[PDB]
Ligand binder design. Sequence first.
Ligand SMILES: *[C@@H]1O[C@H](CO)[C@@H](O[C@@H]2O[C@H](CO)[C@@H](O[C@@H]3O[C@H](CO[C@H]4O[C@H](CO)[C@@H](O)[C@H](O)[C@@H]4O)[C@@H](O)[C@H](O[C@H]4O[C@H](CO)[C@@H](O)[C@H](O)[C@@H]4O)[C@@H]3O)[C@H](O)[C@H]2NC(C)=O)[C@H](O)[C@H]1NC(C)=O
Ligand SMILES: *[C@@H]1O[C@H](CO)[C@@H](O[C@@H]2O[C@H](CO)[C@@H](O[C@@H]3O[C@H](CO)[C@@H](O)[C@H](O[C@H]4O[C@H](CO)[C@@H](O)[C@H](O)[C@@H]4O)[C@@H]3O)[C@H](O)[C@H]2NC(C)=O)[C@H](O)[C@H]1NC(C)=O
Ligand SMILES: *[C@@H]1O[C@H](CO)[C@@H](O[C@@H]2O[C@H](CO)[C@@H](O[C@@H]3O[C@H](CO[C@H]4O[C@H](CO)[C@@H](O)[C@H](O)[C@@H]4O)[C@@H](O)[C@H](O)[C@@H]3O)[C@H](O)[C@H]2NC(C)=O)[C@H](O)[C@H]1NC(C)=O
Ligand SMILES: *[C@@H]1O[C@H](CO)[C@@H](O[C@@H]2O[C@H](CO)[C@@H](O[C@@H]3O[C@H](CO)[C@@H](O)[C@H](O)[C@@H]3O)[C@H](O)[C@H]2NC(C)=O)[C@H](O)[C@H]1NC(C)=O
Ligand SMILES: *[C@@H]1O[C@H](CO)[C@@H](O[C@@H]2O[C@H](CO)[C@@H](O)[C@H](O)[C@H]2NC(C)=O)[C@H](O)[C@H]1NC(C)=O
Ligand SMILES: *[C@@H]1O[C@H](CO)[C@@H](O[C@@H]2O[C@H](CO)[C@@H](O)[C@H](O)[C@H]2NC(C)=O)[C@H](O)[C@H]1NC(C)=O
Ligand SMILES: *[C@@H]1O[C@H](CO)[C@@H](O[C@@H]2O[C@H](CO)[C@@H](O)[C@H](O)[C@H]2NC(C)=O)[C@H](O)[C@H]1NC(C)=O
Ligand SMILES: *[C@@H]1O[C@H](CO)[C@@H](O)[C@H](O)[C@H]1NC(C)=O
Ligand SMILES: *[C@@H]1O[C@H](CO)[C@@H](O)[C@H](O)[C@H]1NC(C)=O
Ligand SMILES: *[C@@H]1O[C@H](CO)[C@@H](O)[C@H](O)[C@H]1NC(C)=O
Lengths: 364, 365
Amino acid sequence: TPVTPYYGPGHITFDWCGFGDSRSDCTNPQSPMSLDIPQQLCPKFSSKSSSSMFLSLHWNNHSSFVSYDYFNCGVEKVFYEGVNFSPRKQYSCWDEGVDGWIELKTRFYTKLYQMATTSRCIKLIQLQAPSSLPTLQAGVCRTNKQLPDNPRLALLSDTVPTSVQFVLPGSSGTTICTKHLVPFCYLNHGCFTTGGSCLPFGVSYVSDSFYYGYYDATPQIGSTESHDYVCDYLFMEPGTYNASTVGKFLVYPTKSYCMDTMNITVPVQAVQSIWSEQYASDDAIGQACKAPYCIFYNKTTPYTVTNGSDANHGDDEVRMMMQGLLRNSSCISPQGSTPLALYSTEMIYEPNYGSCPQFYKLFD
Amino acid sequence: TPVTPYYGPGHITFDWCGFGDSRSDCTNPQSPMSLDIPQQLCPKFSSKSSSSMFLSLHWNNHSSFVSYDYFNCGVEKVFYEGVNFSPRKQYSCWDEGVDGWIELKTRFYTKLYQMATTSRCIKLIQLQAPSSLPTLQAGVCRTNKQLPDNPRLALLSDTVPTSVQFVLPGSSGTTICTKHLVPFCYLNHGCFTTGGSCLPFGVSYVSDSFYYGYYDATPTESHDYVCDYLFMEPGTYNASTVGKFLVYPTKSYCMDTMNITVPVQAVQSIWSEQYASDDAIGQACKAPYCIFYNKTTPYTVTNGSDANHGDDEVRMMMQGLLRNSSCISPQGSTPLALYSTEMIYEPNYGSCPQFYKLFDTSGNE
Ligand SMILES: *[C@@H]1O[C@H](CO)[C@@H](O[C@@H]2O[C@H](CO)[C@@H](O[C@@H]3O[C@H](CO[C@H]4O[C@H](CO)[C@@H](O)[C@H](O)[C@@H]4O)[C@@H](O)[C@H](O[C@H]4O[C@H](CO)[C@@H](O)[C@H](O)[C@@H]4O)[C@@H]3O)[C@H](O)[C@H]2NC(C)=O)[C@H](O)[C@H]1NC(C)=O
Ligand SMILES: *[C@@H]1O[C@H](CO)[C@@H](O[C@@H]2O[C@H](CO)[C@@H](O[C@@H]3O[C@H](CO)[C@@H](O)[C@H](O[C@H]4O[C@H](CO)[C@@H](O)[C@H](O)[C@@H]4O)[C@@H]3O)[C@H](O)[C@H]2NC(C)=O)[C@H](O)[C@H]1NC(C)=O
Ligand SMILES: *[C@@H]1O[C@H](CO)[C@@H](O[C@@H]2O[C@H](CO)[C@@H](O[C@@H]3O[C@H](CO[C@H]4O[C@H](CO)[C@@H](O)[C@H](O)[C@@H]4O)[C@@H](O)[C@H](O)[C@@H]3O)[C@H](O)[C@H]2NC(C)=O)[C@H](O)[C@H]1NC(C)=O
Ligand SMILES: *[C@@H]1O[C@H](CO)[C@@H](O[C@@H]2O[C@H](CO)[C@@H](O[C@@H]3O[C@H](CO)[C@@H](O)[C@H](O)[C@@H]3O)[C@H](O)[C@H]2NC(C)=O)[C@H](O)[C@H]1NC(C)=O
Ligand SMILES: *[C@@H]1O[C@H](CO)[C@@H](O[C@@H]2O[C@H](CO)[C@@H](O)[C@H](O)[C@H]2NC(C)=O)[C@H](O)[C@H]1NC(C)=O
Ligand SMILES: *[C@@H]1O[C@H](CO)[C@@H](O[C@@H]2O[C@H](CO)[C@@H](O)[C@H](O)[C@H]2NC(C)=O)[C@H](O)[C@H]1NC(C)=O
Ligand SMILES: *[C@@H]1O[C@H](CO)[C@@H](O[C@@H]2O[C@H](CO)[C@@H](O)[C@H](O)[C@H]2NC(C)=O)[C@H](O)[C@H]1NC(C)=O
Ligand SMILES: *[C@@H]1O[C@H](CO)[C@@H](O)[C@H](O)[C@H]1NC(C)=O
Ligand SMILES: *[C@@H]1O[C@H](CO)[C@@H](O)[C@H](O)[C@H]1NC(C)=O
Ligand SMILES: *[C@@H]1O[C@H](CO)[C@@H](O)[C@H](O)[C@H]1NC(C)=O
C-alpha cells in the first residue's frame, strides 16, 4: 500500500537539530501561543525571539538588533528563521539600499546551508580582538543606522599600508572548529574621500595559504561619489590571519560561525520565514535554499494566524508542517517525510536522503 | 526481482553525453584497439586524442598542447579525461611547481562538475578580443614553458590604471550561454619588478553586478601563477588593472540551464604505472555534485593499442553505459527494481531500489 509523504521537515534519527527565532522560542512570554513548532520540540532548537542567524553574524545587541549566540549540533538540520532581517526593517548602511542587504542576506544563507551539510555542529563565536591594535576611529553608516559589529570597519589615523592579526580558533569549548564562515566586507565604487583626498579602498584577509581581497582607487566623477557596503561570506580554516590594508581603512572579523566536520554530506532543511501581509518580506531563504545542499519547504499560503499570540506568531500551515518533526521517518525529501515503505503515492524529488519509497506508477 | 549495482557509469535516458580524450576518440588511427569505451558509443562523446578539458581551457594549440573545442549536451554526463594534464607532463610556469598546477587542475574540475549539474550543454568557446586594446607585450613563464593563452597575461607600456572590456556572450551558435566558467589568474607574492620598479600586481574582473580581484604591493623575488575558476553571467565586463599588468579571459566554458540538478559522473583518468598520474579527478569529483568511479587496478592493457590505451577495468566499467538503468550511484547502475543486494550511497539519482535487509521479516537480522 503506497504511502503519502507528510509535507514538512523531518528527521531519521535522534541526531537532528533546529535553528530558529520567536516562533520556536519557548522562553517567549507568550509561549506556547507564540510557537509554530510543537512545544515539546523546543529543546531541539537553538532559537531566540527577534533574532536571526544573519543578524547575529553581523551585529551584537543594539536598540533594534536582538543578537543571539546560536549553537547547535545535528547530522540533520532544520532552519526556521530569517524574517527578523527583512525589508520591513528598512535597513541599509551605505548607498546599497534595502535591496542591497537582501542580497547580502541571500549570500549568507547560501554559504551557511552549503557549509552546514558537511558539519554536525554550528556555533556563533566571538573572536579575540587583535593584539596591538593601532589607533582607530569607529566607522559609520552614511544612513546613520547601526554599523555592523562584524566585520569591524574602522579608520586609521594615517594612510600607509598596515596589518593586524586575527585568530580563528581550532575549538570553542567542546566544539571543534574545522572551519569558519567569516564575512569579508568593504565599501565599493572607487576611491573614498577622507582626510582631505580621495584614497584607495583596499583591504584583504591573508595568510601563507589564504587570500581574499578588494581594491579600488578609481577616481570619482563630479559630485557623484557613492559607495555600497558589500560582503562576501568566506570559508576559512582555523588559524592565524592578517587583516591587511593599503591604508586608512581597516576591516577585520569579530565573530564567526565555528563548524566541525562530519564525513557524510547531508542536505539541510529550510522552512519559509516571512511576515504577515501587513509587512514587507523577502525570498532570501528560498533563493538560498537550493538543491543539492538544501531542501526548501515553502509556504503555499500567507502567514495566517487563527489561534496565536499576534498576526505574526502561530501560522497554521507551518504548524501543520512542523508536526513532521514528531515522527521517526526513513526518507526526507521536498515532498516531506515518509516511513519505511516500498511505494509512494507521488514522485519523490531531490534533494532527498534516507531510504525512500518509489513512485507506485513506476511499477504499474 | 532483486538487482545488484553494475560498477561503472550509466544512463537512465536518451539524453546523455560524454567528454573524453584518446580513449574515447574513434578518429584515432588505432581505434578501436585504442578505446576504453564501446566503439558504438563514440558518437555520444566529445573527445580528442591528447587533449583534456583543463588543458583546452588554458591553452590553444602548441607543440606540446593539443587543444580541442569540447562541446556536448546532455542531462546526464560522463567524464573520462584529465590524464593529458598530469605530473608526467612536468608543467609549471612561475614558482608554483608541478603540484601548483595539480591544485589548479583540481580547482577547475571541481567548478566544472558543480556548474555542469544545472546545465545541459557545455561548450568551450573562443571569446572575442576586447575591441579596444592598447599596445601589449606578452607575458612569459620563468620556466620558459608555454604561458597559458587563457586568461591572457600581458604588459602595458606604462603604469596608468586601465580597463579593457571583454564580452561573455549570451549564446554561441545554437547553444545558449546562461553562465560561463572563466579563469581568473595572477602572479602572487608581492610586487613584481619590471620597467624600473617593483610594481603592484592588481587585476580584477568587474561589472555593475560583479567583482573579483587580487592586489599586492608588498616587498629572491618569487611569484606563483595562481588561478580561480569563476561562475560569470553573460554580459560585458571590465578587465581592470591598477597599472602595467593586464589579465583578461580569451576562452570560457559556455553552459545553458536546465531546471533540475543532476550529478555528473567521472571515471578515474590515469597513466600506466611507469608514469606520474594524479588524483585531481578523485579530489574534484565529490558528493553532492559528482559520482566518482575510481580504478581499483593499475592502467593495465592486455588487448589494446599500447600500454596506455585499452584498460581492462575501465572497458568493463564502460559496459555499464549499454545497460538498462533507472538508478545511477557510486556503486554503479541498476534497472528499476524494489530491492538492491547491496547498499547504495550518494550521490545518486533516478528511482533507486532499497537495500534488501531493511525489509527482512526473518528476523535473523
Ligand atoms: C528494463 O528493466 C526493467 C526491470 O527489469 C524492465 O521492466 C520489467 O519488464 C518485465 C518484462 O516486461 C516486466 O515483467 C512482466 O510483467 C508483465 C505484466 O505483469 C503484471 O500483471 C500480472 C497479472 O497479469 C501480475 O502477475 C504481475 O505481477 C504484474 O502486475 C507480465 O506479462 C510478464 O510475464 C512474463 O513472464 C512470465 C514468466 O513466467 C510469463 O508469464 C511470460 O513469459 C510473460 O511474458 C512479466 O512479469 C516487469 O514488470 C518490469 N519490471 C519493472 C520493475 O517495472 C524493462 O522492460 C526493461 N526495459 C528494456 C527496454 O529492456
Ligand atoms: C588544434 O589543431 C588541430 C589541427 O592540428 C585542430 O584539429 C582539427 O580540427 C578540424 C575542425 O574541427 C578537423 O577538421 C575536420 O575533420 C573532419 C573529419 O573528421 C571533417 O569532416 C571536417 O570537414 C567538415 O567541416 C569542415 C569545416 O571545419 C568543412 O570544411 C567540410 O566541408 C566538412 O563539412 C573537417 O575537415 C581536423 O580533423 C582536426 N585535426 C586534428 C589533427 O585533430 C584543432 O581544432 C585545433 N584546436 C583549436 C582549439 O583550434
Ligand atoms: C582512487 O584509488 C587510488 C588507488 O587505490 C587511491 O590511491 C590512494 O590515495 C591515498 C591518498 O588519497 C593514499 O593514501 C596515503 O597512504 C600513505 C601510505 O602509503 C603506503 O601505504 C598505503 C596503504 O597500505 C599504500 O597504498 C601505498 O602504496 C604505500 O605503500 C600515507 O602515508 C598517506 O598519509 C596517505 O594516507 C594511498 O596510498 C593511495 N593508494 C594507492 C594504491 O595509490 C585514491 O585515493 C583513490 N581516490 C579516491 C578519491 O578515492
Ligand atoms: C543580548 O541581550 C539579551 C538580553 O536582553 C541576552 O539574552 C540573554 O541571553 C542569555 C544567554 O543565552 C539567556 O540565558 C539562557 O537562558 C536559557 C533558558 O532559560 C538557558 O537554557 C541558557 O543556558 C541560558 O541561561 C538569557 O535568558 C537571555 N535573556 C533574555 C531576557 O532573553 C543576549 O545574550 C544578548 N546577546 C548577546 C549576543 O550578547
Ligand atoms: C515561495 O512561495 C512564494 C509564494 O508563492 C513565492 O512568491 C511568489 O513569487 C511569484 C513568482 O515570482 C510572484 O508572482 C508572487 O507574487 C510571489 N508571492 C508572494 C506571496 O510572495 C516564492 O517565489 C517561493 N519561493 C521559492 C524559492 O520558490
Ligand atoms: C488555541 O491554543 C491554545 C494554546 O495552546 C490551546 O489551549 C490548550 O488546549 C489544550 C486542549 O485542547 C489544553 O490541554 C491546554 O492546557 C491548553 N493550553 C493553554 C496554554 O491554554 C487551545 O486548545 C487552542 N484553541 C483552539 C480553538 O484551537
Ligand atoms: C568599466 O569602468 C569604467 C571606468 O571606470 C566605467 O565607466 C563609467 O560608467 C558609467 C556608465 O554607466 C558612466 O556614467 C561613467 O562616467 C563612466 N566613467 C568613465 C570614466 O568612463 C564602466 O561602466 C565600466 N564598464 C563595465 C562593463 O562595467
Ligand atoms: C601581520 O600583522 C602583524 C602585526 O600583528 C605583522 O607583524 C606582520 O608582519 C603582518 N604580516 C603581513 C604579511 O602583513
Ligand atoms: C526553466 O524555468 C524557467 C522559469 O523559472 C522557464 O522560463 C524555462 O522555460 C525553464 N527552462 C527550461 C530549459 O526548462
Ligand atoms: C582483442 O581485440 C580485438 C580488436 O577489437 C577484438 O576483435 C578481439 O575480440 C579481442 N580479443 C580477445 C581475446 O578478447
